[PDB]
Symmetry: C2
Subunit: 490 residues, 2 copies
């Protein structure tokens, strides 16, 4: 580490002029969290649609995404806010079942679905911003879940290649930045290892009230098919559409920073395994066509294998890496319990905590897994540069939350100084990583507006802009929106 | 609650123009934490001097206050920083054993000791600031501890009246704001109930490695004599010095906000008892000449009694209240354990926590008792106004800390955005209390510089200005110092 020649003599010294003139600043979202219109204009149901209405008790506040923040009908006002804030880009996702209601290409193409994304894309570009588009953001068409168990069936790869091709042909003339998948670790672990996400599967002996499953086998299956789906969509783009469209394609991975519990070799080795089982799971295959050695050694037979052809297709199939960072953990070696039933969470032999002898690594945000350690982003960034031959990186999500509290007045709800604290220190550490040679090209805040946080429902708020859910979903910019607008003003 | 007509459209909208033009903004400190020169220019030893060298294992990092930040020799530079920052006042304490080395007036007056405070007082006033002086800030002369057990002996009252008179005669011509005691709750509980502060006493059965004591009796004795000492000094000032000196005298009390765990009557009643045993302990006697009913009912015989004359002297003996606020707790009723040995901590029958069904009240700072809940200051302020007939209030301490971390570079150490967050929201809530009729006249931040935090040693940092303890105690203003200077600039 070696500091930055700045001199933070005023609070206003940290702004966009500190970054290269070409650095991209934007905000991110997903279709299920923002759009609304779940049954409208020919859209078919996703697994998240089904999960929330079938099992309301699996959602903290027993809510759903039928209306969400209604971006479907409010997109002009939303883009208007972005333009006023001086943003450079917008990262959003396309709903698979909105364009192809039955999943398969032979089920029919929803023309009205295609029209919505054309309107959104043209609005983004007309307001001096560039669209960064995510193909899959956890909303598997219900038809494919019913037919072959969605991402647990090999059938998903061919159907996902067809979906990607439809988006490339229809929107490819305007969209020059594509993202195939959004956080395959999250899907694998929360949908198949813990059971908190749709379809809510996990091993029965864990007593997490799951809908069937196996946490020692299914998470690995879901991750393997997700990687094959990515390779299919990425190879199609490069071989048939990249020479005429002139854009780039990548993938978004999520990772935490794992800090050794002590200086001991066992604790040093545990942190490394944490990174291998979270980040390495997806980056090894993407750069080398095989899983990390530690996963191969400790999972043995339960870890799927790539064919020769699958390895060739995967190796190097990305123009950039989309990195998502939020939290950090302390990692210590966990001893092998004799006769333990297999599960992905215990397979790595790590004890992950937020303290070392009762002393905290940092304070917590409203989500119980999010520990604030700004140094983690810089250390994660240097790990990617040094272990994965210095790829081009875009930070595709970064942020924190607060609790939804009905006793607070509007004025009180808009004074989000902890979020300002969070962005200031994380942005400082991104700048130090750039100083040390990391190829970071952009940064996207999660999120512009308050929204549904998956299984947590509307009990937490992640936005820069407050949404009044009791009065026609009114948009009320928080103090952090005004602060970010000033940061971006020259 | 009803908001403030402001409109926090920019971050710079919260400044000193939001407060009345006469509102006082300053910073606070104590003699043991800042001065240094512990054995120099005729000063005698305090109980804190003795405690740290005798028992280095009772201090987290095994440190002492011999040098501290050396304000004794560096006071001109320290006042210089304050003047550059646009502050209105400085709250500091006078060391009892520096002016009277043997405690008693018949032990001799240290002339050199008197000269230091004359130099400091004249420097404060010459730099356009007013001194707010604390007579006792936990540094009991060792001579009086040796002779009659300091604040556990009735002999302390007469000696404390003599000390106060010396300060009034010598410094009274320039000092118009006097504070008799600093946090008698802290002394009573930490020195006699838990054993963490000098002289480190507590009940042997608690297994806290104390130096002797009784937690069911001594804390009550120490608090009773502290109140008698205050009354003696306050009555002397008003009857003999106030008509010619034209100043005012008060006392500084510390209190947390106690939030009911649930809506249940038992939880509502537990929060009230929390306030009675912490704040009420000292405010009841000061306004009514008797302890709160709940303390009288649950402590019975172990609670000392005031004579008729002592009640008359105490009732109304303060011109203003010095209030110290830092943290908030959730309070729930605790059941009576059959056969429990008596202790002040269990006497109130309350279970105090920082969570309700695992959900946090707020995040924690570096000190394990400090939970961040900005609403607490406003609720505490309204409680004082409504229960204690609307006194004149000065907030004499408010702030947060971070850990001393040797792996961080200087630049990294100066980016104290969490402290900015802490002052912004607490200052907003002070403004709302003023709006609802509380008579708040000033606010003092704890503290300007990093210093020794009693039994925690130098493991935590509370300042707006970083002190480099490895390089001639160099002063390096943090981002929060620059932010506070801008807040105070018009």
């Amino acid at each position: 580490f070696k500091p930055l020649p700045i001199s933070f003599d005023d609070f206003s010294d940290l702004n966009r002029s500190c970054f290269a003139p070409g650095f991209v600043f934007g905000t991110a979202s997903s279709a299920f969290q923002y759009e609304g219109a779940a049954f409208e204009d020919g859209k078919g149901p996703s697994i998240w649609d089904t999960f929330t209405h079938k099992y309301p008790e699996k959602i903290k506040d027993r809510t759903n995404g039928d209306v969400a923040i209604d971006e479907y009908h409010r997109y002009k006002e939303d883009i208007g806010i972005m333009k006023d804030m001086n943003l450079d880009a917008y990262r959003f996702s396309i709903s698979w079942p909105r364009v192809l209601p039955k999943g398969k290409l032979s089920g029919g193409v929803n023309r009205e679905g295609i029209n919505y994304y054309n309107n959104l894309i043209n609005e983004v570009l007309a307001n001096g911003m560039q669209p960064y588009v995510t193909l899959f953001h956890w909303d598997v068409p219900q038809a494919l879940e019913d037919e072959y168990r969605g991402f647990l069936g090999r059938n998903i790869v061919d159907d996902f290649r067809d979906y990607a091709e439809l988006c490339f042909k229809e929107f490819g003339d305007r969209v020059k930045h594509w993202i195939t998948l959004n956080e395959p670790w999250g899907v694998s672990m929360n949908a198949y290892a813990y059971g908190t996400f749709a379809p809510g599967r996990c091993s029965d002996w864990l007593k997490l009230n799951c809908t069937g499953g196996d946490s020692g086998r299914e998470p690995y299956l879901a991750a393997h098919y997700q990687l094959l789906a990515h390779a299919a969509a990425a190879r199609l783009y490069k071989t048939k559409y990249q020479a005429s469209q002139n854009g780039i394609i990548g993938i978004t991975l999520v990772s935490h920073w794992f800090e050794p519990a002590s200086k001991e070799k066992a604790d040093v080795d545990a942190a490394k395994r944490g990174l291998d089982f979270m980040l390495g799971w997806f980056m090894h295959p993407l750069t080398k066509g095989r899983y990390p050695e530690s996963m191969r050694y400790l999972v043995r037979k339960r870890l799927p294998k790539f064919s020769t052809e699958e390895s060739k297709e995967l190796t190097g199939s990305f123009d950039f890496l989309g990195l998502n960072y939020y939290s950090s953990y302390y990692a210590a070696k966990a001893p092998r319990i004799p006769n333990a039933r297999p599960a992905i969470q215990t397979d790595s032999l790590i004890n992950a905590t937020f303290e070392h002898n009762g002393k905290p690594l940092g304070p917590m945000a409203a989500s119980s897994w999010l520990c604030i350690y700004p140094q983690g982003i810089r250390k994660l960034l240097l790990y990617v540069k040094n272990h994965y031959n210095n790829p081009v990186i875009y930070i595709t999500e970064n942020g924190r939350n607060e609790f939804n509290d009905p006793t607070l007045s509007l004025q009180e709800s808009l004074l989000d100084t902890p979020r300002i604290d969070y962005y200031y220190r994380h942005l400082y550490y991104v700048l130090t990583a750039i100083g040390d040679g990391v190829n970071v090209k952009g940064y996207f805040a999660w999120s512009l507006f308050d929204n549904m946080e998956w299984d947590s429902g509307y009990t937490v708020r992640f936005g820069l802009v407050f949404v009044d859910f009791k009065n026609n979903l009114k948009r009320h910019p928080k103090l952090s929106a005004h602060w970010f607008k000033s940061f971006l003003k020259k």
